[PDB]
mmCIF file of C-alpha atoms in Angstrom:
data_model
loop_
_atom_site.group_PDB
_atom_site.id
_atom_site.type_symbol
_atom_site.label_atom_id
_atom_site.label_comp_id
_atom_site.label_asym_id
_atom_site.label_seq_id
_atom_site.Cartn_x
_atom_site.Cartn_y
_atom_site.Cartn_z
ATOM 1 C CA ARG A 4 10.273 -7.128 20.114
ATOM 2 C CA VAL A 5 10.342 -5.210 17.257
ATOM 3 C CA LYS A 6 6.987 -2.680 15.794
ATOM 4 C CA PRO A 7 6.457 -3.253 12.229
ATOM 5 C CA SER A 8 5.094 -1.109 9.846
ATOM 6 C CA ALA A 9 5.843 0.299 5.903
ATOM 7 C CA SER A 10 6.898 3.554 5.528
ATOM 8 C CA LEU A 11 5.781 4.507 1.555
ATOM 9 C CA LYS A 12 9.007 6.256 -0.394
ATOM 10 C CA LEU A 13 6.744 7.615 -2.721
ATOM 11 C CA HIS A 14 5.944 11.239 -0.951
ATOM 12 C CA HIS A 15 3.318 12.681 -2.964
ATOM 13 C CA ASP A 16 -0.123 11.695 -5.156
ATOM 14 C CA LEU A 17 0.124 9.812 -8.203
ATOM 15 C CA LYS A 18 -0.962 10.690 -11.344
ATOM 16 C CA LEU A 19 -2.388 8.061 -13.222
ATOM 17 C CA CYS A 20 -4.977 7.993 -17.029
ATOM 18 C CA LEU A 21 -7.555 5.556 -17.272
ATOM 19 C CA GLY A 22 -6.838 1.971 -17.437
ATOM 20 C CA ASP A 23 -3.362 2.587 -15.242
ATOM 21 C CA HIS A 24 -1.695 0.909 -12.376
ATOM 22 C CA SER A 25 0.983 2.596 -10.262
ATOM 23 C CA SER A 26 3.922 1.556 -8.273
ATOM 24 C CA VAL A 27 4.356 3.123 -5.116
ATOM 25 C CA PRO A 28 7.672 1.877 -3.519
ATOM 26 C CA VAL A 29 7.693 1.618 -0.201
ATOM 27 C CA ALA A 30 10.414 1.128 2.656
ATOM 28 C CA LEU A 31 9.008 -0.859 4.933
ATOM 29 C CA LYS A 32 9.211 -1.379 8.645
ATOM 30 C CA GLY A 33 10.439 -4.724 10.650
ATOM 31 C CA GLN A 34 12.845 -6.954 10.451
ATOM 32 C CA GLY A 35 11.582 -10.497 9.602
ATOM 33 C CA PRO A 36 9.219 -12.232 8.060
ATOM 34 C CA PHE A 37 5.791 -10.393 8.707
ATOM 35 C CA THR A 38 2.816 -10.368 7.214
ATOM 36 C CA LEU A 39 2.168 -7.026 5.472
ATOM 37 C CA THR A 40 -1.615 -6.051 4.390
ATOM 38 C CA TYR A 41 -2.021 -3.137 2.848
ATOM 39 C CA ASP A 42 -5.240 -0.682 1.321
ATOM 40 C CA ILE A 43 -5.444 0.872 -1.667
ATOM 41 C CA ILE A 44 -8.907 2.576 -0.478
ATOM 42 C CA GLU A 45 -11.354 4.770 -2.847
ATOM 43 C CA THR A 46 -11.285 8.170 -1.884
ATOM 44 C CA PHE A 47 -15.044 8.257 -4.773
ATOM 45 C CA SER A 48 -16.658 6.086 -1.749
ATOM 46 C CA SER A 49 -16.061 2.599 -0.894
ATOM 47 C CA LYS A 50 -13.972 -0.056 -3.107
ATOM 48 C CA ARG A 51 -11.261 -0.267 -0.753
ATOM 49 C CA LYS A 52 -8.709 -3.241 -2.100
ATOM 50 C CA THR A 53 -6.615 -5.049 0.594
ATOM 51 C CA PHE A 54 -3.391 -6.671 -1.018
ATOM 52 C CA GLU A 55 -1.570 -9.117 2.270
ATOM 53 C CA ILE A 56 2.423 -10.733 1.197
ATOM 54 C CA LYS A 57 3.284 -12.690 3.913
ATOM 55 C CA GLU A 58 6.822 -12.739 5.418
ATOM 56 C CA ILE A 59 8.301 -9.512 3.775
ATOM 57 C CA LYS A 60 12.177 -9.602 5.049
ATOM 58 C CA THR A 61 12.533 -6.526 2.840
ATOM 59 C CA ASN A 62 11.957 -3.226 4.432
ATOM 60 C CA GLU A 63 12.347 -1.487 1.368
ATOM 61 C CA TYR A 64 10.119 -2.790 -1.672
ATOM 62 C CA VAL A 65 7.892 -1.228 -4.251
ATOM 63 C CA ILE A 66 4.436 -2.194 -4.034
ATOM 64 C CA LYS A 67 2.591 -2.556 -7.670
ATOM 65 C CA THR A 68 -1.254 -1.007 -7.256
ATOM 66 C CA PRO A 69 -3.737 -3.321 -8.704
ATOM 67 C CA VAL A 70 -5.264 -1.489 -12.417
ATOM 68 C CA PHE A 71 -7.518 1.416 -12.008
ATOM 69 C CA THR A 72 -10.494 0.823 -14.907
ATOM 70 C CA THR A 73 -11.285 4.734 -13.498
ATOM 71 C CA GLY A 74 -10.321 7.826 -12.880
ATOM 72 C CA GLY A 75 -10.458 8.359 -9.730
ATOM 73 C CA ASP A 76 -8.709 9.438 -6.361
ATOM 74 C CA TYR A 77 -7.288 6.374 -3.993
ATOM 75 C CA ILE A 78 -5.214 6.427 -1.213
ATOM 76 C CA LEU A 79 -2.401 3.497 -0.270
ATOM 77 C CA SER A 80 -2.200 2.695 3.077
ATOM 78 C CA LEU A 81 -1.532 0.261 5.967
ATOM 79 C CA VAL A 82 -4.132 -1.991 7.459
ATOM 80 C CA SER A 83 -1.718 -4.807 9.348
ATOM 81 C CA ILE A 84 1.332 -6.047 9.777
ATOM 82 C CA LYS A 85 2.417 -9.663 11.117
ATOM 83 C CA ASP A 86 4.782 -10.609 13.498
ATOM 84 C CA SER A 87 6.825 -14.144 12.637
ATOM 85 C CA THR A 88 5.122 -15.612 15.540
ATOM 86 C CA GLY A 89 1.448 -14.573 14.775
ATOM 87 C CA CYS A 90 1.476 -11.422 16.249
ATOM 88 C CA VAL A 91 -0.929 -8.610 14.464
ATOM 89 C CA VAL A 92 -0.212 -5.188 14.295
ATOM 90 C CA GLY A 93 -2.536 -2.287 13.843
ATOM 91 C CA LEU A 94 -0.166 -0.125 11.547
ATOM 92 C CA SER A 95 -0.497 3.766 10.935
ATOM 93 C CA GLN A 96 1.891 4.946 8.944
ATOM 94 C CA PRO A 97 2.209 6.993 5.837
ATOM 95 C CA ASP A 98 0.094 6.898 3.447
ATOM 96 C CA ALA A 99 0.740 7.379 -0.235
ATOM 97 C CA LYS A 100 -1.796 8.792 -3.038
ATOM 98 C CA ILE A 101 -2.837 7.399 -6.503
ATOM 99 C CA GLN A 102 -4.992 9.354 -8.425
ATOM 100 C CA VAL A 103 -6.121 7.984 -11.929
ATOM 101 C CA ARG A 104 -7.813 10.537 -14.668
ATOM 102 C CA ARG A 105 -9.976 9.304 -17.828
ATOM 103 C CA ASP A 106 -7.647 10.263 -20.992
#
């Protein structure tokens, strides 16, 4: 039994322009086919984005965050992960920040 999760390698906020997307490298936790769910959430209000990649067997995967067509402030956090037996684990490990601006 393992406690799976994610540990982002991007160790600070990202400076983007408008219409920019980002790429946050994450050395993920949990060894085996895990369903990795994470939230790219806005601190701006509630445009919380959610992405789920099943059976991540990587433990070192750089994530590509969707294009931000508006300068704002976002945090990529971890929602939940899933063991290959179908066991969802509450993810609470380091998060990333994506700060988008308008050029």
